Design a protein around this nucleic acid. Sequence first.
RNA 1: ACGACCGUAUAGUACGAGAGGAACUACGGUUGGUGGCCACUGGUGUACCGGUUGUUCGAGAGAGCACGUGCCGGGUAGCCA
RNA 2: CGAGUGGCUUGCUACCUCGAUGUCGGUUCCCUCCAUCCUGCCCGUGCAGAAGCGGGCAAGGGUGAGGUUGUUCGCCUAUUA
RNA 3: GUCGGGUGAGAACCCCGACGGCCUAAUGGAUAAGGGUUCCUCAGCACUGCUGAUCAGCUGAGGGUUAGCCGGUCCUAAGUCUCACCGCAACUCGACUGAGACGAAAUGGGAAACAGGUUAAUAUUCCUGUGCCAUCAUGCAGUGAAAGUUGACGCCCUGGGGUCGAUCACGCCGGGCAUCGCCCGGUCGAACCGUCCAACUCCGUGGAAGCCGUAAUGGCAGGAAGCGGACGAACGGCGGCAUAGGGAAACGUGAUUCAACCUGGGGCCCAUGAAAAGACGAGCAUGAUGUCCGUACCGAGAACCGACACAGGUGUCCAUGGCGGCGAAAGCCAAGGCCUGUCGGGAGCAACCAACGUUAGGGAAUUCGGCAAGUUAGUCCCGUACCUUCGGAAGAAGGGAUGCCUGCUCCGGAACGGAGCAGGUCGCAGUGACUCGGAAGCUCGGACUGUCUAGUAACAACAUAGGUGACCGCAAAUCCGCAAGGACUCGUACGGUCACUGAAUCCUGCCCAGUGCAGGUAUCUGAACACCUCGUACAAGAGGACGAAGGACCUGUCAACGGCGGGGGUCUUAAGGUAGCGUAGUACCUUGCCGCAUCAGUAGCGGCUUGCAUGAAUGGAUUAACCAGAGCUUCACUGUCCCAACGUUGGGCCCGGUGAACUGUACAUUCCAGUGCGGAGUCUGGAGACACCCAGGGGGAAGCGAAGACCCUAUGGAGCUUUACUGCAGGCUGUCGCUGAGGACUCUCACUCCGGGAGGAGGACACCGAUAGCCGGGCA
RNA 4: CGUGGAAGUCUGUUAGAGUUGGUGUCCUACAAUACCCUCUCGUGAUCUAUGUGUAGGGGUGAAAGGCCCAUCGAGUCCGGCA
Lengths: 237, 56, 73
Amino acid sequence: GRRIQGQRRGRGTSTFRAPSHRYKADLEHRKVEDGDVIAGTVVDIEHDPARSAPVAAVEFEDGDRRLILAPEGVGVGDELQVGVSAEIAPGNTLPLAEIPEGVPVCNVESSPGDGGKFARASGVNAQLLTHDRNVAVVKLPSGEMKRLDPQCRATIGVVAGGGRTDKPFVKAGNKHHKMKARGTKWPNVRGVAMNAVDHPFGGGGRQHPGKPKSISRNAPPGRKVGDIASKRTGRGG
Amino acid sequence: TGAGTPSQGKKNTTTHTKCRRCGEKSYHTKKKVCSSCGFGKSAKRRDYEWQSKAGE
Amino acid sequence: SSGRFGARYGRVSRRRVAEIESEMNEDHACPNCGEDRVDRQGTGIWQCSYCDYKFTGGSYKPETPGGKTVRRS
RNA sequence: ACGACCGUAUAGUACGAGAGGAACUACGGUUGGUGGCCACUGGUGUACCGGUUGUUCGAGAGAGCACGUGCCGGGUAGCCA
RNA sequence: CGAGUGGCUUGCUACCUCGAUGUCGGUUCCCUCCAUCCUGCCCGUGCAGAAGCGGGCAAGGGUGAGGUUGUUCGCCUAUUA
RNA sequence: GUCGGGUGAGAACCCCGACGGCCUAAUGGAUAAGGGUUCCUCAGCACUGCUGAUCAGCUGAGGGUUAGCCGGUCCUAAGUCUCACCGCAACUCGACUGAGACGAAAUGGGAAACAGGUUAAUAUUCCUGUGCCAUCAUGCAGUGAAAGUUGACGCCCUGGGGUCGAUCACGCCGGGCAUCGCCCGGUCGAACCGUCCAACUCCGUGGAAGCCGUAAUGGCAGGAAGCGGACGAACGGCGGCAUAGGGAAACGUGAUUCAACCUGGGGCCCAUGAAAAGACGAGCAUGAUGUCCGUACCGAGAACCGACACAGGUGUCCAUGGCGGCGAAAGCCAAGGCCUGUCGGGAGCAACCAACGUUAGGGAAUUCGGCAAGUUAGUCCCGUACCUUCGGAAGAAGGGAUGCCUGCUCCGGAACGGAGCAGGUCGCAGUGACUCGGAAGCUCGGACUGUCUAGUAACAACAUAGGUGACCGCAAAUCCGCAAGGACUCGUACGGUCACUGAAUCCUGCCCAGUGCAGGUAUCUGAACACCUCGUACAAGAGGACGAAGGACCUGUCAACGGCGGGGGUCUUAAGGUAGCGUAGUACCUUGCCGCAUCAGUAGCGGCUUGCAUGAAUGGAUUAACCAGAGCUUCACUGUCCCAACGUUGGGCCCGGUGAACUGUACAUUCCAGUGCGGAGUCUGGAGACACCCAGGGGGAAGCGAAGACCCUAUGGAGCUUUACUGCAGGCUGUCGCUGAGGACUCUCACUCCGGGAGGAGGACACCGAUAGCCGGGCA
RNA sequence: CGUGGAAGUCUGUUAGAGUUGGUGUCCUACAAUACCCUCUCGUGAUCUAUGUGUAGGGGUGAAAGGCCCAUCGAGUCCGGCA
Ligand SMILES: [Cl-]
Ligand SMILES: [Cl-]
Ligand SMILES: [Cl-]
Ligand SMILES: [K+]
Ligand SMILES: [Mg+2]
Ligand SMILES: [Mg+2]
Ligand SMILES: [Mg+2]
Ligand SMILES: [Mg+2]
Ligand SMILES: [Mg+2]
Ligand SMILES: [Mg+2]
Ligand SMILES: [Mg+2]
Ligand SMILES: [Mg+2]
Ligand SMILES: [Mg+2]
Ligand SMILES: [Mg+2]
Ligand SMILES: [Mg+2]
Ligand SMILES: [Mg+2]
Ligand SMILES: [Mg+2]
Ligand SMILES: [Mg+2]
Ligand SMILES: [Mg+2]
Ligand SMILES: [Mg+2]
Ligand SMILES: [Mg+2]
Ligand SMILES: [Mg+2]
Ligand SMILES: [Mg+2]
Ligand SMILES: [Mg+2]
Ligand SMILES: [Mg+2]
Ligand SMILES: [Mg+2]
Ligand SMILES: [Mg+2]
Ligand SMILES: [Mg+2]
Ligand SMILES: [Mg+2]
Ligand SMILES: [Mg+2]
Ligand SMILES: [Mg+2]
Ligand SMILES: [Mg+2]
Ligand SMILES: [Mg+2]
Ligand SMILES: [Mg+2]
Ligand SMILES: [Mg+2]
Ligand SMILES: [Mg+2]
Ligand SMILES: [Mg+2]
Ligand SMILES: [Mg+2]
Ligand SMILES: [Mg+2]
Ligand SMILES: [Mg+2]
Ligand SMILES: [Mg+2]
Ligand SMILES: [Mg+2]
Ligand SMILES: [Mg+2]
Ligand SMILES: [Mg+2]
Ligand SMILES: [Mg+2]
Ligand SMILES: [Mg+2]
Ligand SMILES: [Mg+2]
Ligand SMILES: [Mg+2]
Ligand SMILES: [Mg+2]
Ligand SMILES: [Mg+2]
Ligand code: NA
Ligand code: NA
Ligand code: NA
Ligand code: NA
Ligand code: NA
Ligand code: NA
Ligand code: NA
Ligand code: NA
Ligand code: NA
Ligand code: NA
Ligand code: NA
Ligand code: NA
Ligand code: NA
Ligand code: NA
Ligand code: NA
Ligand code: NA
Ligand code: NA
Ligand code: NA
Ligand code: NA
Ligand code: NA
């Protein structure tokens, strides 16, 4: 048959790429030698086209002007600090070790100095639970307990723009506009609505998958479709 | 819209042009590659054994 | 306010759009001063027409339940 | 190139207990078909005459255009049913 | 039970055409057959009359309009000689 | 088009005049692409031109395109290339990372030009006049000089400033008309230099506790109004330019509405609406320099693409010419263009055909079906049902009004804006043409806008929001690449990938036996290396021990594939169809039965319903709104019909000119029968038959057109499928190499990842190379 | 009551896009997909010019096996090939 849509994706053609040239900033934590003597002032609050969430323009002491992944409650004029000795207030960034347990955090680093990887989407947050000289246990937004190096930096507070998901798109056009700002092909044609040549579920006199939807982890691309290595399906039991 | 005559009307785009290297009207001005001599793609001249019968 | 939708989309969709946009359009007390003068400038962006204070908040409310928790601990 | 039917007189008669109820013949009409014709009725009638909207020729008068008459009203001959 | 006629149905056969003989139903227009539905002329009757039933000769003319259905067919309605 | 006339050997179509018409977002004006000399002149008619030609986009020969300030050039956009690096057997191949370059002529950004005149043909290019920009040189000034501003920005609504145009008033100049006194045109004048400034912002004053303000929102003791001031706009006003230019002349003045242009206020985003060069910041005189490329013409019913002078296709600007009216609508008419959507002449011009008008009485009887046509119509007033998601349904339905003329009232600053009143008055008809809905009900489907089979399918199909399940913590899940590498990703679970269902409302039962996926697993099974035994002076080979993933086995899971019966008052094989719906777009029997409706209803709707073979996200039921979706009923309407007629325009017919194609074994005036491979103009027997020609509608030549797309056959083909055969990628897993120190463990030194670095995490694992077992229509 | 002016909102041959019926005209065409009337959309998942990217078992596909230059259940050209 023909390559399935999921296979066309990987080639990285225009249709599947994110409108990168239209994006504003790669939101990473600043690098500080040590000491913490790095503070800046929020100069503006802007919309981030890559995340449908606000972002903050900060002007640092040493003349550096950069956009920052903004937590809720950050405003123009506010002074933010980054470093070991940073104050424990919303919007500041310091290593997990300097953060008091039980405090909501966002933009958590996976490896110390990577600029942040976890809890960055609208209104989310990680929960710093356990401290130690060896490991800082953080609960990610998915509910998972993550063991991290206490040296991994993070920002105090929950990510801004919380509740974005609360409102329905209502119409195709609204989804369309959002989709145009992402690396995604939309709308979505169901496999079962296609011809056999185009998809493992295509074909038939009526619409139905011709086999069980639960596919093995070992299935090759072009065949891995439907419910991937599902431990279970449905709602009952 | 018919794919024949009615679709022939929008054809006012210049692509293949007189090539600087071979003189043939094959230099694709959009690609900057001559489809006849290979100019723009290779220093060596474009040529293939299939351009003639196998035993010739 | 979902009246702009006419007879389209169904109950749930427009009931929720009305409720959400209603709370979004309510007078909001500025964190800087204290005046009920905060309006939405865009997605998650809030600003006081009085003192000009521009800040981050929820997508449709200036304060979310998660954000109100931060202050505590 | 004529086919067929209905009606009247025959007759409330013949027949028949009664109920009911014919025919020959002579008449009138209808229907279908056929051929022809236009005095009559009807249609058409961008011949013609009138009314009137918009616009243009300054107004008036008198006209052009509005699809092969702008629209509306009347309609001769002829052709027709 | 026995003997037949027709070639409208159906089945059988595989002769004809696969370098193609355009489908069903309908329509329109022409000719024909008779195993006659009406009409003409007759015979019988369980033929009083009236109305019928059955049969003979006979193909001149007629055999129409509608409701459902693509329907052919058929069902149904009101007319009809 | 017509009548005259011009030229010519020759004139319906070449030119002049008159008369008559056509085009109004185009048939006019300016252009992009594309064409490429098609432009202009002269001379021609063998070619081309749907006829002719003295004409020409044709033939021949000459000529024609002039720039500091219009484009290019310069900048950077999506993105492209080059070199380096790396990969690859290799390259003209290949992803990343560096560096460099390229990438916008209408239509991105951008130093600077206007007016007049001139040619057969150019023109912000030439000429005249005036203006302007950049660079450099000289002189004066200046030490400032880089912070900042600009370039530079989305969608919706709206105020103010304001020019052209248009219109109104009045004056002047010229023209037209001639029963009045009206009607038309003109009344000019740039770039540039100078000056003015509304809005926004800010400062001082002031001191509002209720005031200020808007079309609207709004503003204020954190200091409102008022007053004063700073900064500050037009392609605008004003003055110069200008005893420049232009006009035969006059060579105006005010006004309204105001495109351009300028400047503000508001609203929206699960959408956030380029960049760089450059400019400003940062004065003035004088002088010098300003090269290179483009420039003709068409820009289309004859200059482009479509084989053609093709009824097709093809971007931008002129969107403000008059009447009209809501209008960039119709209709009519200017300016401007044209009579080249290029063959004519004749016949009351027949039949027949294409478009079309009108048809008495009846009124869907026509037909699969109202197909086609018709009806209605603009605006104002009254009035408006079921149902409903409260939005809608709705312009429901239905009823009334509508012109002109005279004099007026009201809103507004006013309009050549709008709303009304009284009286008079004409027609069959006052939205008088034009423009301009027919309406109502029942049922089915899909919720809606949207998408689609370029070229027979627009639908109920696809999409959609919404619902749901699955995978993944990012050194991820998913996917591309042979590799080097890469998309997702300037992203991080409120994410994004992979699927199913398909708005809302009420709901979504039972089944894990089979199949799939996933977890677990004492025991069983389970490859290769290494190891043990036998064999071989070695080796082949045989066997053993250990045993990974996988399988057996156990468990979970159906909004996973799917299933929900026969029998009796259990059996197959797990369950044995719950809410609902039901003769269904699913019901064979079938036109089921009853009812509605009709004269009559295989239709339609309602009820019943034992459902040949309904049923819950293979979603069930139901549903307001929506629909060029399927079926049915009613009012209205009508040439669809009864049943056809007459008329209009273009053909048809005759004449001049131009001038193909299809098709053709031969013969051929046939007809009725017969015969024949059973479907004969040609054989046989008869019948009929003087030849040629015109028009017609198509009975026959099993008419012409296409080596049947149905069917079968061929040890034909291809696309597709799968628990067909055989293999190949890919995933998982053991083992060997990289690989190191001290059946569970520690370490650091390779190697990997994070970090700018110091250093941190991980670590002999992983990655990679080799091999072995399992899965493996993803692919051959 | 007014103000305000929302909408994949309505009417609309504004421009522009689309293509339902006529199974009309044409069917050796004006045209290898045309003409006319009728009809749908027309502030948005809108339409459009130019530039630009994706390439053949590969693209692209709101999915019709649609489209990739009159060529598509695997483009076109030449070769294998007599
Ligand atoms: Cl989303
Ligand atoms: Cl130019
Ligand atoms: Cl305002
Ligand atoms: K055959
Ligand atoms: Mg980033
Ligand atoms: Mg995209
Ligand atoms: Mg879908
Ligand atoms: Mg399909
Ligand atoms: Mg497949
Ligand atoms: Mg389905
Ligand atoms: Mg399904
Ligand atoms: Mg094609
Ligand atoms: Mg006329
Ligand atoms: Mg035939
Ligand atoms: Mg007989
Ligand atoms: Mg006879
Ligand atoms: Mg010429
Ligand atoms: Mg000449
Ligand atoms: Mg360049
Ligand atoms: Mg430009
Ligand atoms: Mg010229
Ligand atoms: Mg020119
Ligand atoms: Mg022509
Ligand atoms: Mg009539
Ligand atoms: Mg009927
Ligand atoms: Mg009938
Ligand atoms: Mg119709
Ligand atoms: Mg007044
Ligand atoms: Mg009318
Ligand atoms: Mg039905
Ligand atoms: Mg739909
Ligand atoms: Mg089609
Ligand atoms: Mg449609
Ligand atoms: Mg169609
Ligand atoms: Mg669907
Ligand atoms: Mg969904
Ligand atoms: Mg969702
Ligand atoms: Mg979803
Ligand atoms: Mg029924
Ligand atoms: Mg279920
Ligand atoms: Mg003979
Ligand atoms: Mg054949
Ligand atoms: Mg077949
Ligand atoms: Mg095959
Ligand atoms: Mg790295
Ligand atoms: Mg196969
Ligand atoms: Mg709309
Ligand atoms: Mg519309
Ligand atoms: Mg393009
Ligand atoms: Mg198919
Ligand atoms: Na399927
Ligand atoms: Na044959
Ligand atoms: Na027939
Ligand atoms: Na007879
Ligand atoms: Na019948
Ligand atoms: Na001519
Ligand atoms: Na000025
Ligand atoms: Na006007
Ligand atoms: Na729409
Ligand atoms: Na099961
Ligand atoms: Na199972
Ligand atoms: Na079922
Ligand atoms: Na639609
Ligand atoms: Na008629
Ligand atoms: Na014939
Ligand atoms: Na095939
Ligand atoms: Na209101
Ligand atoms: Na059409
Ligand atoms: Na191919
Ligand atoms: Na070949």
